[PDB]
């Protein structure tokens, strides 16, 4: 069967030199993850439980 899951609120995004700054507003613990799109993705992830 198919389950319904929530979508976290859009982040507030500002930019710097080679930098993206996100302010996150989770209602409940939300997984954040990111990767480089090159040879070495340097994958990192963390759970966000509060505004960060």
């Amino acid at each position: 069967v198919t389950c319904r899951v929530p979508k976290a609120r859009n982040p507030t995004v500002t930019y710097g030199k080679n930098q993206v700054i996100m302010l996150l507003y989770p209602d409940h613990p939300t997984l954040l993850s990111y990767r480089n799109m090159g040879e070495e993705p340097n994958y990192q992830e963390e759970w966000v439980t509060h505004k960060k």
Binding site: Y15, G16, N18, S33, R35, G38, P41, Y43
Partner: protein
Amino acid sequence: YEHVTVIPNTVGVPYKTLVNRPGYSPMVLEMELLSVTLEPTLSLDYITCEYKTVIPSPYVKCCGTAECKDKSLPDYSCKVFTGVYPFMWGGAYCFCDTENTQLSEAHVEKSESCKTEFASAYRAHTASASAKLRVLYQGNNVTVSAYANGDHAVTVKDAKFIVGPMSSAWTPFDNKIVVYKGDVYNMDYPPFGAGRPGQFGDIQSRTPESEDVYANTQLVLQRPSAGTVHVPYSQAPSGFKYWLKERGASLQHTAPFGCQIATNPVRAMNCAVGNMPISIDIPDAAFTRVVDAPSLTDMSCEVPACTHSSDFGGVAIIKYAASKKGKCAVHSMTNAVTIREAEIEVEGNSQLQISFSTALASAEFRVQVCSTQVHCAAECHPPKDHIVNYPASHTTLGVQDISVTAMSWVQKITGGVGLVVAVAALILIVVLCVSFSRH
């Protein structure tokens, strides 16, 4: 006419190739990859799922000793416990107090859930490539779905397009692949029959329907508590359940080159790796002779603005004198500068506008319109924006690709030092010549 070109293996970025057949008006084709898929050949080694432990009602032999037989069941154990004095709700189970034995037995088998909840351990080999390509051919947008193994020609308005083989054999998938649902993992799973308790592969089966089950759960039967008939045991909890909690990120989130991962079938999509050759066969009927085509003369290029941003921030205005009204192909003569328009409509004595993108600090490039070339030059300025949501439409710069003033300063400094050396060298040579002249 057979034309062979190569485009970078990127998605969402259009590339333009010039088809130059002398005596005929030039054609410019804009090709954009919309999707690139690599589908690995898979060979199932085994599957895993949660096991259930089956414990048949215990046999209590009153006033006598029970014995058990060996069984071939996947992970079977039997033990006879003496000195048992179990109670039922209405009182002691049987007549004898101490002369009683209980036979406990259990085996491990695949649960009913294994039909829905399971992971498949596959061996991955080579991958079949396929791609969806958008081609702008003679002003029309045609999307073709074709294989990218170099063995499939797909027709676009009577032109044949052969795609591939891809120049890179790289795949996000390792030799050992484990698939749960929509998630694919590069896990080095144990060989069938070599599983370990509490770990992935503790229970293994060759196929979902197979009755042949391997199990290593360390199922140990324990003595029942006094006065009871229950059958206690110590067993390593399913490694499948542990794995599900400890899965970590799937390849969809960890793969290099921004690869997207999907299952059913297993696919790696839109990997930004290497490049992809395209061979185009265009029939003579598709070519217009230069005598019938529009021809431009007295052309002059001026660039009122230039920004070296990822988008088409540059604009160039080119004056032209057209021999007749009609559409005309536009091509950039340098890799450093990407022109957005593939074709323009021209007539009479007027000017045309084209947009371009370059990483160059100083944009020096030539533009070919209806086989007539012009020279464009501009001083480009940097963008104020730091981040965008789209890839650059232009190529990267080489070490030689520097601004005009930077080159001038380099020549002045290099020449300055070179002059000092040349003078010092001349003085030394003259002095040595005098020294050699003298005896």
